[PDB]
Amino acid sequence: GTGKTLLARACAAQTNATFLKLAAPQLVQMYIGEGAKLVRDAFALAKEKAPTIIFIDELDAIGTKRFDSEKSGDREVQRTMLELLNQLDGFSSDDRVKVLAATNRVDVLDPALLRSGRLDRKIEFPLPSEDSRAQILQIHSRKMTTDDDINWQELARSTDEFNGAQLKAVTVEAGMIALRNGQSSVKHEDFVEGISEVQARKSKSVSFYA
Amino acid sequence: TRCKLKLLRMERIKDHLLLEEEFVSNSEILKPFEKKQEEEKKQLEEIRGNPLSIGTLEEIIDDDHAIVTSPTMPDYYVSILSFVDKELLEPGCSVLLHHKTMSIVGVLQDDADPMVSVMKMDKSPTESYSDIGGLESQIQEIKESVELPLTHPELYEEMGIKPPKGVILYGAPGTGKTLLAKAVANQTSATFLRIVGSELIQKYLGDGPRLCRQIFKVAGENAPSIVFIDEIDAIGTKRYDSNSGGEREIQRTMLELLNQLDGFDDRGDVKVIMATNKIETLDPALIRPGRIDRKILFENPDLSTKKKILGIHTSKMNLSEDVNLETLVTTKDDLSGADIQAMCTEAGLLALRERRMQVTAEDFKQAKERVMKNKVEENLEGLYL
Amino acid sequence: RYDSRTTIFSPEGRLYQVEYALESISHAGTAIGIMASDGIVLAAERKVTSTLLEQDTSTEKLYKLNDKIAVAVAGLTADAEILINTARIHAQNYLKTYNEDIPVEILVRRLSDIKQGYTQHGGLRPFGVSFIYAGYDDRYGYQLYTSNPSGNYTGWKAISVGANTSAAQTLLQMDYKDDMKVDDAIELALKTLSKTTDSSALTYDRLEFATIRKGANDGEVYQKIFKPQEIKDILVKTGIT
Amino acid sequence: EKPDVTYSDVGGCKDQIEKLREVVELPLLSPERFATLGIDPPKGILLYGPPGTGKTLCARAVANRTDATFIRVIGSELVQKYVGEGARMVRELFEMARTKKACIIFFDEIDAVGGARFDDGAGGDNEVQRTMLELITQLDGFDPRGNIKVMFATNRPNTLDPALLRPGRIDRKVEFSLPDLEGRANIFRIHSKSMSVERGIRWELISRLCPNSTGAELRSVCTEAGMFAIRARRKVATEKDFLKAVDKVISGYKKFSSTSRYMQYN
Amino acid sequence: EYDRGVSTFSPEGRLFQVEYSLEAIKLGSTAIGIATKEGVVLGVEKRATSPLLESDSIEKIVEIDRHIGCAMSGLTADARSMIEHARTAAVTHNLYYDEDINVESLTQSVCDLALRFGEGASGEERLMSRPFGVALLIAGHDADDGYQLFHAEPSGTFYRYNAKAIGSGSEGAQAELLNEWHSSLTLKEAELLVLKILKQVMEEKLDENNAQLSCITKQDGFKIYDNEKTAELIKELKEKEAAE
Amino acid sequence: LTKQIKEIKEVIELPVKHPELFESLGIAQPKGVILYGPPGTGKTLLARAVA
Amino acid sequence: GYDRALSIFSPDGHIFQVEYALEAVKRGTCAVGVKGKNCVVLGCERRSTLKLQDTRITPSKVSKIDSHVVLSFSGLNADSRILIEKARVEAQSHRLTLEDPVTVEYLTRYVAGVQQRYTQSGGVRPFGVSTLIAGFDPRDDEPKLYQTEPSGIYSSWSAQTIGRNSKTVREFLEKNYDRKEPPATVEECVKLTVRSLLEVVQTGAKNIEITVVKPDSDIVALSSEEINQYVTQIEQEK
Amino acid sequence: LRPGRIDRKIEFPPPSVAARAEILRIHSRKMNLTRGINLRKVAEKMNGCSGADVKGVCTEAGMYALRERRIHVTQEDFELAVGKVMNKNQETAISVAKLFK
Amino acid sequence: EIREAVELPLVQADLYEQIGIDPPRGVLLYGPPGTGKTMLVKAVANSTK
Ligand SMILES: Nc1ncnc2c1ncn2[C@@H]1O[C@H](COP(=O)(O)OP(=O)(O)OP(=O)(O)O)[C@@H](O)[C@H]1O
Ligand SMILES: Nc1ncnc2c1ncn2[C@@H]1O[C@H](COP(=O)(O)OP(=O)(O)OP(=O)(O)O)[C@@H](O)[C@H]1O
Ligand SMILES: Nc1ncnc2c1ncn2[C@@H]1O[C@H](COP(=O)(O)OP(=O)(O)OP(=O)(O)O)[C@@H](O)[C@H]1O
Ligand SMILES: Nc1ncnc2c1ncn2[C@@H]1O[C@H](COP(=O)(O)OP(=O)(O)OP(=O)(O)O)[C@@H](O)[C@H]1O
Ligand SMILES: Nc1ncnc2c1ncn2[C@@H]1O[C@H](COP(=O)(O)OP(=O)(O)O)[C@@H](O)[C@H]1O
Ligand SMILES: [Mg+2]
Ligand SMILES: [Mg+2]
Ligand SMILES: [Mg+2]
Ligand SMILES: [Mg+2]
Ligand SMILES: [Mg+2]
Fold this sequence. Notes:
9 chains; F: elongated; G: globular; binds adenosine-5'-triphosphate; hydrolase; 26S proteasome; AAA+ ATPase
């Protein structure tokens, strides 16, 4: 929820190159050694239409830290991880063709997966900073009613430990408050009560000491 | 002897005369209608040829066509047309094609699986109702939630509301719980499915919940129906494998139950009985009410009750020659009705050593000692003394 | 599951470790006391033997704890060894303090606490020893007891511990006589020991024997351990050899 | 297909239910309401609470109200040992629903297919979590979905995966809670509306003696009072038989549940 | 893991093992104390698991001084150690200053024994090996603060209160105390108030065998009532509600 | 191993041969019979011999 | 659940080790206490394991701790044996301090005290023994009956039963007994005890053992003959 | 072990010195006797604990007798067969551990 | 043990019937793959004719 998916979709479609739609959970299939074949057809499609960017949605299906296994169907899962490495192996006309990949878990990805030659750039997306939070609010608010009572630098400070998707849930939930009123206008107050909707709490702490 | 014969008199004559009738009548059925019926037979015969290529129906589109996928492998875009209707065709059914041009010429087949054999019982119990004798206050409880709203729906609209859904029979072993499920279902003549909860665990991973889909898919078509899940206590610590049944499955099978018995599906009009010997083993949300309603607790039969249970077993037997039958009951305190059936088992075993064919009173006293000794261990009065 | 340490119970109020400790006992040989008003015989059987095991120079399943109380041992002999030393030390402590050779009851009760104590406190192992206590005290005359490894005691007229406890007990109570003779008591111990033990011939060297008597000269208490040759002769009399 | 259960059979006067009606129903019925603001309203909604609070009752009731194809998905149909098979079920279902216009996809009881990633080097829980990964990517999409409202009833949101829970398309998270003291009277009057009863009864007394509880237990006062009606050979129910009926269900509940107190001699 | 430790923290920052001990406090019988400006009245519920149980020779209101009393719930086993320590502290204070012990200060001593959980932790030498499954309502009177009611929590530390309920019925009792309390109360009112709330949170019948009041009134000292006194107040209550 | 042969004839052989005997007695026919002991003594071979 | 260890608490708030300790009490012989007004009678089942068991030297199930307090037990016999000896060193020590004999109220606390201590700690298991302590005060003549349990909680009861099918005797007792008038004659009170004990033995008059405490350091153990006459009265009337 | 389904319990004992010697003979009778009887010597030294032992004694003897190359099977082959089956079962008991306990 | 299994009943079948001992049967070779299992089978196949 830091807007990985959205950036990729947007800026790949912006520059002009082949945008492949490929999913990690897809690569594991119920038929033996067909799942491997499907990695080979994806790279084939990239090589005809090269340069291509292959945006892989998720990366944690094949982002398996196991290929030392015991009595399981897991030997099919890790087989299509190894096939990914063989089709990121140089083999000619593959320089042009890249892989974008979004993931939510880096700690379970393989150490042969993540390392140069394959994934070269390892770019981190943090929880958005105080200013950065502010910026996201105004960018959703440019599609809906905006009042000059509102001050977006106030709201930013009072959101403490809000990721960008939670900040879509400040701005959405403000319009939920505005409708429940029966207003045909959103006020600045509705946004404060938009902050109270998600917090990962319901306005609590649970303690037997304070 | 002469009492047996009165029963034997009606039984022989009436059914064997009906057999002799039906035999002659096979011919006779054709004779009054042989120009509607053979007319219909003719027209049936003419459109469908030979053979009748059996396919398995994937799905129909309601406009007079369907997509079928045969076992012989080719898929065909058929017509629903002639001696077949759109209501008679429902997925997973086996449909009849005419071979030379696939037109759906009828459906005469829905089941042939080995799977559905498992669920159904071809049952004949040796103890039926009123050999549940005693604990009658609490048989009255299972009646109200199983037998009597099937038998009169009248009473449950006179009070209004829904008839209570299901029950859990639970308590100590030997307390006659099994015999209850089998015997209340004798009364009603409803379809008695039976599956054990040591057969709800599977030696294949993630097939366990598929099996649990099968139990109430079966229940729902053959309804009104009484589904016995016997021994659902074996869900909490009894499992076939760990790397091909595993921990995931045990929890999933219970999640599956929830959706069957009060999920959207709802699956009204399946009475569910669950016998479990411990209700503190069972899952908190499966002992949620409104899918199994009230619980009936049984305890080791009490001193007057064990008179009843002794008379049920010794009615078979040749009785005590001196009679000490009433004192047997007295010696026992805090004991099961299974001790009573193991005592008349044990009396006639001592008798079986002699390979005598009578039984005398004295075997009773011996047999009670023998089987009490078996119960008590040498480390109980080792640990203690 | 509950087959661990001693603090923990089983939900059936069983301490598995006392139950197993009982079972330790029947992996060492049969040991029998039979009480008679003429004396007590203590008789024991060897757990195993070979043809060059020396067992005619010493006893090691019959120990004197004092000069009027003696014990037969069945079970682990290592566990036994420490408990026999503790019993014997106490037996003389009683001597020093009161000028009387220790009563049979005080000595059994002491050791019952000690066995119990190793189960109850700490992380220490329970004991897996059954001692048949056969004594004299001038209160109760002749006395037989046996103590469980569990750490409790009961008085007896006959008892069998060690291997083959059930059968050895049955044959004993079948032919038992209330007054008995000392001489008959010795005979009934060989008769039982023959059928329970899986040794082909019952040899003097598979037997230890001691007798405690006040009827072998009165005024005095005489502890008579049988030597190999005395054991060897009495088999003849009973016609096993 | 839908049953005939409305939110007239779902009680309290709960605001909790109205969160359901402004997220699911209102943007399909008239998105004009949300174009006055210019907002985009929620797509998703996370439904959670204690068992027998009416999670499934609102899944029945929301199906009738919209007149939109109701789907519904069992959170334990999605596992076999042949791997990525529950990825086929979830994929094809989600693609199928793009083509229908105005749907509610009701995943019941997800706590399996809603755990978390783990590698253990000898694991087995891994095979199952594959299929949850397909669900995330189908939800957010290659392209965003819309005019598909996805409701999720979770028994345990404590397992529930962090990346379904975050409110990037599950904007509104509403707890469906225990009924209040005067909340429990309204509920109990929907079940006694079918129930044949004689006036001279005070339902607000029968609520007050009952503690905070589930509406499944509230169904166990009505049913239990009713089989005492059959046995007495009275056709109606009255107040006295409600008194015994609450006492039977409260007192029986402690016995089934665990209680092994050190207060059974003191 | 976090809960099967004893000094192991959970990822929310709660010592789970210690958390679990709060549900020990609740299993026992309800006691409801209400502080007033005339004195503190402490009531209990005492369970009878048999008619044969002598409920009137067992108590859970105890004397700690001549102006300090304590209510308790949880393990009477752990109540024996908690009450014994507290009695020692009152007496040793009396030894050292020949002066009344303050209500709060007796509470600090009861919370010191509570701190101890450990087998390695520092502060004081840890000798006690688990939490205590038992709470106190601490009642007294010093004259320089007045009549006071404090609540001891073995998993926390001393809380000042005007009224607290502890036990099984605590949660529902507490609402009623939010509803009906006043600073305009006399002890006479206050006594019929403990009883009026108690009965509703009772599942046993309201009678004198299952009840027992005591007061800290500085003038009268710590006084455990009669069964004859407690039976009177049940009648006066019944008269009041009929009128009402 | 002659006493174990007697023992299995009681509970398996006689209720096959004569099911007239156990009705006259009124004794219900046995379900479980635990054949048990140290391995290799003759446990599988006993239920074979009677078959 | 949380029976892996004693010190760890439990979501359910019940220390499992104590609960299982109770369960162990049911192993041992039944013991029943019934108070009069001038008597307490403390009877116990004396279950005979074999006919080779002495009555010459074999321990009675009832043990006098001091010369006017009496004690029976139900439980693990091994465990009871040190519990009774520990009770006794203190008991006698009570006179060392005060030059007063042992008061029954001080004594129940102490027996509950050794037990509470064992539970509090982690490196010992609790005693699997519940005891009944009967007696009168030295100072006074009103009959006193106490109980200790594994847990370390003590109570007073008018009449109370523990071990071997305790429930069935407890109910029996309620129905027979009257709290308005407890029996004020030693004989009739004995008779109530015998009737209870009859039940758990099923058959025996050589396996019922009766002991009585009376005020002013009278403790007596009843003849086997004397008990059989009471059984004779109870069989005839029935 | 629930009541009313178990009422007969057949325990196999470990067969004694006499008892093993009859099952021992039946597998001798398959082949040809030693013809002076040494079977019983075999059967009384060996305390064994299994009837599986005694069919294997006969297998080993007949394989020693193959080396020997005679129709007749001598008794010296039945001395070696016992000394091997017997020695091997004392290695499952980790020396003379019965002695040490 | 394997010249005992293969070579000795192939040529001297008469001797096994003469003692009254059963023929040898199937031969299992099992163990980790270092062990030389194959090497012997190749060997004995040449010599046994
Ligand atoms: N920085 C942001 N600016 C705008 N909207 C954002 C931003 N962060 C999150 N969102 C909103 O939340 C949605 C969820 O984030 P998105 O899928 O793009 O990324 P992610 O970090 O890979 O998360 P996940 O894979 O868990 O969904 C976005 O599509 C967008 O609507
Ligand atoms: N009240 C009774 N009337 C008649 N027979 C009884 C009665 N109660 C018990 N029985 C007899 O005892 C037998 C054994 O009990 P049954 O097999 O029904 O077990 P259960 O209590 O369900 O145990 P579990 O389900 O734990 O295996 C019954 O089949 C029946 O013959
Ligand atoms: N708000 C309510 N109004 C009326 N009846 C209710 C209400 N809540 C619960 N119920 C009753 O309780 C029954 C069980 O509740 P339901 O199946 O709807 O719950 P849930 O919260 O999804 O539980 P589960 O954990 O089993 O999924 C309902 O069928 C209904 O009879
Ligand atoms: N006893 C030996 N003398 C000579 N060479 C040997 C000996 N044992 C093994 N070798 C050699 O070791 C090598 C591998 O052994 P071999 O081919 O017999 O494999 P193996 O144990 O059957 O393996 P697998 O488990 O794959 O069947 C061969 O070259 C073989 O000649
Ligand atoms: N006591 C015995 N007498 C004869 N052969 C035996 C004996 N015990 C085992 N065997 C032989 O070994 C084969 C397999 O025995 P096994 O499966 O171990 O069974 P059991 O439990 O009957 O000893 C038997 O078919 C038999 O030929
Ligand atoms: Mg993403
Ligand atoms: Mg059953
Ligand atoms: Mg639900
Ligand atoms: Mg076998
Ligand atoms: Mg090879």
